[PDB]
């Protein structure tokens, strides 16, 4: 199984009442481990997963340093952005940033990432090859030409193919217990009778990790999508995930319906029916 | 491991 690490920054200008609020968070796959809040009392990179506490003071110092520095870098880009886009200084604006790497089952560098978004719109992004850039508009075309002549890509390529993977690897092993585990979905199904000759069969999937899961509603040996009500996967808050898809079903035809649950933590895809 | 990000737009 391929694993991934992502850090996610979020700078928000609050004109005339302080420097922007900067909130960065890091995940390995679907599990988060660190965070940083420009406003929280720590003024340090705080752990979130049990296993990252394992890291020594050197790690925390350097990590704190890097992210604080990033916070400045973007606080200034928030200004640079305004000029490039001829926007007012009294408006509140949002500069989200994302960087990370992927590792294969082997632990080999799979793919790196680095991209910025001003007020929730692709601004600049490092291409798949970590050698050139893709700029959104005439605004980023400036930042692009700047970063081209500074060989910034090279700098980033070095981080992505180096520090980034090295850390992702260390973490997966450090917290092997937690991160490589695959909590299977504890699936059941309940009856919700509605009006006349009609009912609701809610297919439940609870306490599974990771969040990648696919629910199928098949009746009579035939897949059904029209009466399916599948909510976007949701967290449990305990480090697991949840999802349900209901179908409106005629009175007495309940035993003719089956639910197909595919997940990484299962030996084989599950099949569920109305069990009175 | 966080990134060494220091460049300006």
């Amino acid at each position, epitope marked *: 199984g391929s694993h991934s690490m992502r850090y996610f920054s979020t700078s928000v200008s609050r004109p005339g009442r302080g420097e922007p609020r900067f909130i960065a968070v890091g995940y390995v796959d679907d599990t988060q481990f660190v965070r940083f809040d420009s406003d929280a009392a720590s003024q340090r990179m705080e752990p979130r997963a049990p296993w990252i506490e394992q890291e020594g003071p050197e790690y925390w110092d*350097e990590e*704190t*340093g*890097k992210v*604080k*520095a990033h916070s*400045q*870098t973007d606080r*200034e880009n928030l200004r640079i952005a305004l000029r490039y886009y001829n926007q007012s200084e009294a408006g509140s604006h949002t500069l989200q940033m994302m960087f990370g790497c992927d590792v294969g089952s082997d632990g080999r560098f799979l793919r790196g990432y680095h991209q910025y978004a001003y007020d929730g719109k692709d601004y600049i992004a490092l291409k798949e090859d970590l050698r050139s850039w893709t700029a959104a508009d005439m605004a980023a075309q400036i930042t692009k030409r700047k970063w081209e002549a500074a*060989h910034v890509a*090279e*700098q980033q390529r*070095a981080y992505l193919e*180096g*520090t980034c993977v090295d850390g992702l690897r260390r973490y997966l092993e450090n917290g092997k217990e937690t991160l490589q585990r695959t909590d299977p979905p504890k699936t059941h199904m309940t009856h919700h009778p509605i009006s006349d000759h009609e009912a609701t069969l809610r297919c439940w999937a609870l306490g599974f990790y990771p969040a990648e899961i696919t629910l199928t509603w098949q009746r009579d040996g035939e897949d059904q999508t029209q009466d399916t009500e599948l909510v976007e996967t949701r967290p449990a808050g305990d480090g697991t995930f949840q999802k349900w898809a209901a179908v409106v079903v005629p009175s007495g035809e309940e035993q003719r319906y089956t639910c197909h649950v595919q997940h990484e933590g299962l030996p084989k895809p599950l099949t569920l029916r109305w069990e009175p | 491991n966080y990134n*060494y990000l*220091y460049r*300006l737009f």
Partner: T-cell receptor
Framework: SMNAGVTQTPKFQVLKTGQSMTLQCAQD?????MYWYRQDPGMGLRLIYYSASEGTTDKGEVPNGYNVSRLNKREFSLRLESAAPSQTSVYFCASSESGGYEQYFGPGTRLTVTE | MRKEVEQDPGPFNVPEGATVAFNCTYSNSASQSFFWYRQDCRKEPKLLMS???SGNEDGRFTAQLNRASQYISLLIRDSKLSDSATYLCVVNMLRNSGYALNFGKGTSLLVTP
């Protein structure tokens, strides 16, 4: 390039160990980050203070006996409140677009403190 | 003395027209940028050129970075009395909070006719 962007003043100074004194620095290049270094033979450049943005300042490798003030986007002052033989060095100031960017240096200032 | 940038100092007498190669070794693996600086005796440091992995040619001057082995090289062909001066290895890297420039004590060249 005459790098006349960065300007230090004075080029030479001499002091009674008691005396106070302030060196001045200015960059016309519209950089954000300015730095006050101190080149002593057999140790090379060592940073005293710096100023990453227009508003803020921070201590460097050897900020003792020294104090700075980034009065403005262009100007960054180094101030010796009470000179000491110890503080006899060459002092260089420099600016760069932002932190970690190639630094452009002033001509530097030769200061000597005598009992 | 403890130095993240180490540069063999000592005058390096070399004849004019001769090739000179200089090297510099940086400790901190998290170094992000790399530069060569030429400083004339009794004068200020001037950026000579930034050194990149892809390689950096500039006529007489040529410089490479080895991230792997953590060294940078500057090589000057057809050396000239004019380029007699002290060469400073400069690398940026995260000091405290804020990326900052570390300067080598510098190696001093003396081209002679």
């Amino acid at each position: 390039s005459m790098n006349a962007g960065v300007t230090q003043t004075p080029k030479f100074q001499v002091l009674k160990t008691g005396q106070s004194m302030t060196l001045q620095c200015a960059q016309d290049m519209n950089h954000n980050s300015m730095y006050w270094y101190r080149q002593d033979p057999g140790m090379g450049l060592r940073l005293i203070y710096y100023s990453a943005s227009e508003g803020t300042t921070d201590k460097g490798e050897v900020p003792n006996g020294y104090n700075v003030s980034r009065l403005n986007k262009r100007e960054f002052s180094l101030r010796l409140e009470s000179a000491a033989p110890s503080q006899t060095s060459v002092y260089f100031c420099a600016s760069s677009e932002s932190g970690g960017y190639e630094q452009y240096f002033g001509p530097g200032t030769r200061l000597t403190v005598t009992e | 003395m403890r130095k993240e940038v180490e540069q063999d100092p000592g005058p390096f007498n070399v004849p004019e027209g001769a090739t000179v190669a200089f090297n510099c070794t940086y400790s901190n693996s998290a170094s992000q940028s790399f530069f060569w600086y030429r400083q004339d005796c009794r004068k200020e440091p001037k950026l000579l050129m930034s050194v990149y992995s892809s390689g950096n040619e500039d006529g007489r001057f040529t410089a490479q970075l080895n991230r792997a082995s953590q060294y940078i090289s500057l090589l000057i062909r057809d050396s000239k009395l004019s380029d007699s001066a002290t060469y400073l290895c400069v690398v940026n890297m995260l000091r405290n909070s804020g990326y900052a420039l570390n300067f080598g004590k510098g190696t001093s060249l003396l081209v002679t006719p």
